[PDB]
From a paper:
ArMs consist of an organometallic moiety anchored within a protein scaffold thereby combining some of the most attractive features of both homogeneous catalysis and biocatalysis. The biotin-streptavidin technology ranks amongst the most versatile platforms for the generation of ArMs. Herein we present an E. coli surface display platform for streptavidin (Sav hereafter) relying on an Lpp-OmpA anchor. The system was used for the high throughput screening of a bioorthogonal CpRu-based artificial deallylase (ADAse) that uncages an allylcarbamate-protected aminocoumarin 1.
Two rounds of directed evolution afforded the double mutant S112M–K121A that displayed a 36-fold increase in surface activity vs. cellular background and a 5.7-fold increased in vitro activity compared to the wild type enzyme. To our delight, [CpRu(QA-Biot)(OH2)] 3·Sav-S112M–K121A afforded high resolution diffraction data. The crystals were obtained by sitting drop vapor diffusion, followed by soaking with cofactor [CpRu(QA-Biot)(OH2)] 3 and flash freezing in liquid nitrogen (see ESI†). The [CpRu(QA-Biot)(OH2)] 3 cofactor was modeled with 100% occupancy within the Sav biotin binding site. The piperazine linker and the ruthenium carboxyquinoline moiety are localized in a single conformation within the biotin vestibule. The aromatic quinoline ring is stabilized by a methionine–π interaction with the neighboring S112M side chain. The aliphatic side chains of L124 and L124* (* indicates the neighboring Sav monomer) and the carbonyl moieties of residues K121A and S122 form a pocket that harbors the quinoline ligand. Spherically-shaped electron density around the ruthenium suggests that the cofactor may exist as a mixture of epimers (i.e. (R)- and (S)-Ru). The Cp and water ligands were thus not modeled due to the ambiguity of the electron density. X-ray crystallography of ADAse double mutant S112M–K121A highlights the localization of cofactor 3 within the biotin-binding vestibule.
Residue numbers in the entry:
A (entry chain A), B (entry chain A), C (entry chain A), D (entry chain A): 10 to 134
The structure:
Amino acid sequence: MGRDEAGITGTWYNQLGSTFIVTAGADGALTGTYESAVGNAESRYVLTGRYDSAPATDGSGTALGWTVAWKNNYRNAHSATTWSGQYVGGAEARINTQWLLTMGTTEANAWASTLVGHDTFTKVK
Amino acid sequence: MGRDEAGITGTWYNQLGSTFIVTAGADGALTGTYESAVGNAESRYVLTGRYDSAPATDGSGTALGWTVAWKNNYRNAHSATTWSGQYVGGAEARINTQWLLTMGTTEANAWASTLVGHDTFTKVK
Amino acid sequence: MGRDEAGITGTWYNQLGSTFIVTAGADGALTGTYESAVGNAESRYVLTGRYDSAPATDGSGTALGWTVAWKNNYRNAHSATTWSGQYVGGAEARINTQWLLTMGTTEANAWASTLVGHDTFTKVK
Amino acid sequence: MGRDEAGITGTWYNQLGSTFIVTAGADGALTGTYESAVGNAESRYVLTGRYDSAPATDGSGTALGWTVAWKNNYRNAHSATTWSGQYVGGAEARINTQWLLTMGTTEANAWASTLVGHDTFTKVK
């Protein structure tokens, strides 16, 4: 019932080898789990987000985003990442994203609190 | 039961005059609504996110993030913003954030798909 | 001879207490020195950049940017920051910027190579 | 005389088909020209920047950055982009960057003034 509800739901892999498992709801919800292949992270972490459930019909991608806070039963990196991007459907479907990773810091170090990057997710590898 | 569950839950206002109403769950969940004072937006939009429910005890802020997809019953801007930041408690409590706003685009225009900025939220104004 | 050649040339201070001394050329050049109040930095570092020497006449700001590589005779942080922003003239003139700070890394750590932030520069403090 | 003075000097091409011609100075200077394959741009634009002329010797990349203001004799987009990244040498040498593109805006629209992205440059294509 979302246009890309079906295209988005499932398992995605990025260039780092991380795994994003997501379910897209009819209404715009994203829920799932994230496992990072890098960094101070082990096992799965909860994720939540949103997507545009009625995208433009002119060949544009589907805007979406989601957040992981890097606390689970195993580790707590006192950090959260948000990914902002778009889903592009078709035989080589992709989710192209940029992300912001904020670490909790003291006020003195807050200038250095946020990393930025980019991840591309595919349905294989 | 989250350390800052109580400090985060409520109504926050940014420098633009936008309003963020959020509830923080014991486990790390953020749910609420967002109303932008600017842009191609009207009324409230759903938001979801995550926060670190066991932050460092050394005066560091609390990492968190959340997403709004800019579709509601009134408008659809075919866009999503994610905010990444930290909550800082005390008499002048703040949520200091950076954000990424992705518009759905064609592949040809994808280079120009993402705006970046920064918002600071307070409990007054 | 640049519209804001005169408004930009001089000494500017950001929210951190850093000092940016710049000369703007008629043709679009920015040259000067930068002294960071924070981080792995001591004394002055060379900076170079560019500005729009014929901005729009409708009350818009003046786009500009510049780079510092964090090597001088005292220290080498194996890093470079670029600021992208706009100059806004008038009784409270400002340069509002966002910045990207890249550290040289191994390929394995390149995902974590770039910090992002924002600085606002004024003619006082 | 810079460690990567020779590796950086020359002609580079990004994923968009843009062309970056640069000379690296012994002391850390970058000078050259940029031609964008996309956007409101025609022909070459001046660029200036900086690089770390004494990078770490442990296989880390070489931090660098540069700026283009999008005014030349043909067009003026009232914008500037800064790229922040690192040079990685070897048989497949690359410059991996993130960038910030600021448009001059009114104060009311300044929230929407800055695009963010990422470009990867190679010596072929």
